[PDB]
């Protein structure tokens, strides 16, 4: 069912994820500490978490077959546009349904709606993010699907600034066909079609979430910017 090339793609993506996601979360101890009582007391800790996560996303992207073959400029636009979406996706691994929080192994490293708001984010923007996480979690995806979706998310031809959209499209299509084939090996029709249609809808949701926060963001006018990291400043503009 899966050709050797499709299997080779998945093997590479699984290994990329395993190298870039540490489920012990030990590195969190080196962040500025979380502070819950200011007023943005969680912003240093959460800014470090985002900065760290951007680095992991870069790591992952560099292992995506053909990504490195793109021009540097196209690699840069793809990552600047996709980074927050991939972080939202990858974060589903820590997300817990019972508490509606991201549980990273300890009470201190367990993040809820109030903690995110203490990082300077609006409740109106956070609610769809939680909703997203719940819906994703309910799909109960295999790790093979999870890493392929992350990859598909990164390599999208329809991101602004992409010069070589055909080449970017050729990579995503190989990833997409691999994903479709994977699902079909796990499920006959029509369940296969329904599950794929759901993943596609989740990518559109992520995109709408990105566009809504960046709309807000681009429509904002130092005290908080000072607390961000150099890499976050660069990536988020």
């Amino acid at each position: 069912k899966l050709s050797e090339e499709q299997q080779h793609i998945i093997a590479i993506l699984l290994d990329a994820h395993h190298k870039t996601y540490d489920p012990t979360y030990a590195d969190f101890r080196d962040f500025r500490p979380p502070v819950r009582m200011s007023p943005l007391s969680m912003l240093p800790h959460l800014a470090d978490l985002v900065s760290y996560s951007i680095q992991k996303v870069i790591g992952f992207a560099k292992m995506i077959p053909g990504f490195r073959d793109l021009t540097s400029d196209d690699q840069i636009v793809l990552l600047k546009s996709s980074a927050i979406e991939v972080i939202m996706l990858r974060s589903n691994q820590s997300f817990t349904m019972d508490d509606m929080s991201w549980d990273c192994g300890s009470q201190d490293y367990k993040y809820d709606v109030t903690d995110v708001s203490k990082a300077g984010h609006t409740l109106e923007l956070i609610e769809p993010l939680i909703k997203f996480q719940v819906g994703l979690k309910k799909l109960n995806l295999h790790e093979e699907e999870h890493v392929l979706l992350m990859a598909i998310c990164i390599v999208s031809p329809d991101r602004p600034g992409v010069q070589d959209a055909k080449l970017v499209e050729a990579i995503q299509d190989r990833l997409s066909n691999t994903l479709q084939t994977y699902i079909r090996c796990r499920h006959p029709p029509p369940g296969s079609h329904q599950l794929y249609a759901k993943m596609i809808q989740k990518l559109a949701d992520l995109r709408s979430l990105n566009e809504e926060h960046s709309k807000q963001y681009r429509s904002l006018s130092p005290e908080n910017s000072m607390k961000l990291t150099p890499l976050v400043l660069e990536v988020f503009g």
Partner: peptide, 11 residues
């Protein structure tokens, strides 16, 4: 412009 990102991509 995006110097840190460029470096991170080249290494």
């Amino acid at each position: 412009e995006n110097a840190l990102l460029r470096y991170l991509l080249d290494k």
